[PDB]
Ligand SMILES: O=C(O)c1ccc(Br)cc1O
């Protein structure tokens with residue numbers, strides 16, 4: 001894409017040790033699957049394209065970008081060592097939205113619907129085995 005958007009977050013790095021855990025499997029097969037198909041998922045399914053959206057200040061404000069397209073790749077390509085890393089990526093995505101946008105805004109209400117679902121699912125994150 002555009003040189004004016006940053007490169008996306010890292011999804012592949014052989015130097016980073018990787019592991020499958022039952023918790024990570026749940027994050028893919030339950031959590032991500034649920035949020036991805038939500039009616040309000042589409043703004044969060046790829047990095048924010050600040051050029052196309054005419055938001056030239058977006059990456060001036062948001063210095064830790066994250067999105068569900070990145071998280072999906074990270075889960076499908078086994079990037080993580082543990083569930084906390086992946087939960088932190090979800091939380092970063094929500095908090096970016098809430099920091100950049102006004103509390104009324106449609107994108108915020110969309111993020112909040114996904115976050116409510118997320119919380120319900122994370123409360124049932126299985127014990128690590
Ligand atoms: O099971 C599937 O086919 C599937 C498809 C998309 C996503 Br996101 C999660 C899934 O688990």
Ligand SMILES: O=C(O)c1ccc(Br)cc1O
Pocket residue numbers: 042043044048053055058096097100101107
């Ligand atoms: O600025 C944002 O947070 C944002 C993200 C994705 C889309 Br699509 C529109 C937006 O306004």
